[PDB]
Design a protein around this ligand. Sequence first.
Ligand SMILES: O=C(O)COCc1ccccc1
Length: 185
Amino acid sequence: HHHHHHMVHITLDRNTANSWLIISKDRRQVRMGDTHQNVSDNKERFSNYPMVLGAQRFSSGKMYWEVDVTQKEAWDLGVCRDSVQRKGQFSLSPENGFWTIWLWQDSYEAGTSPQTTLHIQVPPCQIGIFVDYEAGVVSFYNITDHGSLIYTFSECVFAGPLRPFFNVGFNYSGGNAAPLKLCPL
Ligand SMILES: O=C(O)COCc1ccccc1
């Protein structure tokens, strides 16, 4: 792909983080802690899952960023509406305001309803995410495999401002402690 010139500098919004997340000083890395991180509750925080939003809001244009997923067993990445549900149980789907892919149990899937099997020959260490607001497109790229396409959501109905979306996943196994990291431009 040739989307690199739409690179945007994403930072994480502490206020939206699940209370077990640890966000680095530079707001570019997140991992799930082994306990509650001693923050107050608020209506923005994802309560049920180890999720956090980027601070940036997008309502027009083309945007691109990259995320490092090295050594993780489970994660979700993409974009979501600013107005997504924060509290209780929900599925990641475009009907609920999410445009995402994930790794889970050694398979990759797109967050359609129902979910769609992805075909990845080279497990990615970094993921590129491209959003074209006007076109209604969200695309995912395998940076480890020379930028090969992973998945395109088209005919997207954003229906509001978009925010970068992250889930570091649980660490029941002891093998999923590693952070998600926003990679330099
Ligand atoms: O099972 C665990 O590792 C943590 O449980 C508490 C919790 C933390 C974050 C989100 C939901 C529940």
